[PDB]
């Protein structure tokens, strides 16, 4: 039977300071016991000073990042170029994820 | 695109007339005469075969049509409208009756279904009424022989005998003088041929006249043997030769 999920490995890490924040992630991408790439980035600048990583199943991860990046673009179009605050981004991402509640994005997301 | 005509094309005028139904009846008046006579042991329905050209083969155009083995139909008015009504009538006898009860519908109920179809063309969106009046003759076990007229409005009436179309006024008067409640089927056929000659102008023979009966069961026309309860169709179309035989002793 076809299994629509896979595991691409890797790990990510976010820490917040007083006037800064970091989002780190390794660049290794794997399936089973094989290395697919030694340098495949999964931490992205999404605009409006928001960085994002969706780690787990890379296909779902890329799809989510792609949809959120697009959500930022349309937020500008619809609300007079207003900056998307980190709290508003967070709430928006919840709805992106929960929209597929019964066929989930197989990722841990950090912004 | 798509049928944007979702509104009625037949509507009430200030005087209360339904214009399109009246005009449909006018088309029936222009149509060639057809008639029906009910005897004690059968029914006869007849009409003239108005040929469009002498090069046309009028045998290929059937004005009298079998609906069920015991029910037949003839009309006056627009031929194409009649043809599609016969198709629908044959189908509805199966879908709304035979496929449910395992037997053919009684005459009155098949007539009722055809009447419904014609009524809907009077009220539904984007259609004109049918431009025909039907005469439906038939037999069933519990009602015996019957004869019905169906008009463009969807109204139907049972008749002892009647005529519709071109010379219906004169033909009805002729039938009133001749009809009694003791007529045998052969007497009714004789009167049918007499009545029709008045309205026919040109040739009057078995090739220009179409005539069918609802009478006794015809085991020879069944196509098989072995089932006692199945005894054959009561509907039979008289042949060109069979008509000419009766035109000599006229």
């Amino acid at each position: 039977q076809f299994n629509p999920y896979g595991d691409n490995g890797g790990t990510i890490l976010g820490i917040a300071g007083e006037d800064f924040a970091v989002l780190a992630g390794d660049t290794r991408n794997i399936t089973d016991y094989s290395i697919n790439s030694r340098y495949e980035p999964k931490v992205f600048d999404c605009g409006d000073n928001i960085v994002m990583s969706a780690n787990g199943f890379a296909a779902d991860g890329d799809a989510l990042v792609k949809r959120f990046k697009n959500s930022v673009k349309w937020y500008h179009f619809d609300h007079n170029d207003k900056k998307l605050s980190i709290n508003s981004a967070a709430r928006n991402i919840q709805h992106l994820l929960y929209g597929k509640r019964f066929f989930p994005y197989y990722v841990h997301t950090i912004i | 695109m798509t049928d944007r005509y979702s509104f009625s094309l037949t509507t009430f005028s200030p005087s209360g007339k339904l214009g399109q139904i009246d005009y449909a009846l006018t088309a029936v008046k222009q149509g060639v005469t057809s008639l029906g006579i009910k005897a004690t042991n059968g029914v006869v329905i007849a009409t003239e075969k108005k040929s469009s050209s002498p090069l046309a083969m009028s045998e290929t155009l059937s004005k009298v049509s079998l609906l069920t083995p015991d029910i037949g139909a003839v009309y006056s008015g627009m031929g194409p409208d009649y043809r599609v009504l016969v198709d629908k009538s044959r189908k509805v006898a199966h879908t709304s009756y035979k496929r449910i009860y395992g037997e053919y519908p009684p005459t009155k109920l098949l007539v009722s279904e055809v009447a419904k179809i014609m009524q809907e063309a009077t009220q539904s969106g984007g259609v004109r009424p049918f431009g025909v009046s039907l005469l439906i003759a038939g037999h069933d076990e519990f009602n015996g022989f019957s004869l019905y007229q169906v008009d463009p409005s969807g109204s139907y009436f049972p008749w002892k005998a009647t005529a519709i179309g071109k010379g219906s006024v004169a033909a009805k008067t002729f039938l009133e003088k001749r009809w009694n409640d003791e007529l045998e089927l052969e007497d009714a056929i004789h009167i049918a041929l007499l009545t029709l000659k008045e309205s026919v102008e040109g040739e009057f023979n078995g090739d220009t006249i179409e005539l069918a009966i609802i009478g006794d069961e015809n085991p020879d026309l069944l196509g098989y043997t072995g089932i006692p309860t199945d005894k054959g169709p009561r509907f039979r179309k008289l042949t060109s030769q069979e008509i000419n035989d009766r035109l000599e002793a006229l």
Partner: protein
């Protein structure tokens, strides 16, 4: 599906189909609502060109929407049944989800919304009906009387009338109804309602219907004799 825009604007900015629906209301039998200090009374005209009627079974002019709210109307009788049915369904639906019966304002707002929807939907004509909706909110003793009309607008009234010759009875109510002192009792409220109809009706026989609504689902319809006593009493005081 039939799509035609039947209710549309004209050059002068009127929606004629909505305005012609008001004419149907003007043709309908007169209906009046008067609210007292502790009650609301709904009075209705019944035309007397119809003798040989069976009043047991003939649809009553005042309808219960719930045990605590009533609806009367003026205009097309057939149209009103559709509004009443929808209102009754919404009443039960409200009890089901909110666990509390409708307020009179809410029920009115719903009925008015339905009427409005039929003024800018394709393939439909507006309702030829104006309604008077009266009752008491759950656990409340303040009387409520509302009016709706084909356009969809609604409002609250101390007293109001609709239907044929309603302008005459509105005139009467405008000088005979004191805002500072509404009819203090049931008797006073019924009398003022009967008086107002007697300006327009004809005979006070089987031409007037009266329904009294009191707090906590206390609704009762008066009989002929009970109403006739008000008619008899009013005429004797008039000869003065």
């Amino acid at each position: 599906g039939y799509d035609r825009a039947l209710s549309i604007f004209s050059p002068d900015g009127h929606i004629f189909q909505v305005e012609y629906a008001l004419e149907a209301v003007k043709r309908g039998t007169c209906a009046v609502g008067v609210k007292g200090k502790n009650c609301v009374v709904l009075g209705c005209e019944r035309r007397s060109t119809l003798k040989l009627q069976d009043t047991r079974i003939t649809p009553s002019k005042v309808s219960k929407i719930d045990s605590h709210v009533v609806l009367s109307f003026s205009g097309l009788n057939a149209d009103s049944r559709i509004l009443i049915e929808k209102a009754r369904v919404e009443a039960q639906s409200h009890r089901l989800t909110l666990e509390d019966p409708v307020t009179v304002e809410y029920l009115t707002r719903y009925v008015a919304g339905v009427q409005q929807r039929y003024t800018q939907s394709g393939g439909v004509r507006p309702f030829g009906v104006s309604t008077l909706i009266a009752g008491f909110d759950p656990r409340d003793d303040e009387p409520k009387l509302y009016q709706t009309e084909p356009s969809g607008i609604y409002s609250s009234w101390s007293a109001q009338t609709i239907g044929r010759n309603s302008k005459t009875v509105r005139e009467f109510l405008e000088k005979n109804y004191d805002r500072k002192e509404p009819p203090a009792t049931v008797e006073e409220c019924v009398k003022l309602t009967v008086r107002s109809l007697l300006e327009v009706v004809q005979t006070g026989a089987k031409n007037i219907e009266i329904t009294v609504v009191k707090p906590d689902s206390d609704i009762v319809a008066l009989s002929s004799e009970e109403i006739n006593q008000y008619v008899t009493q009013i005429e004797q005081e008039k000869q003065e």
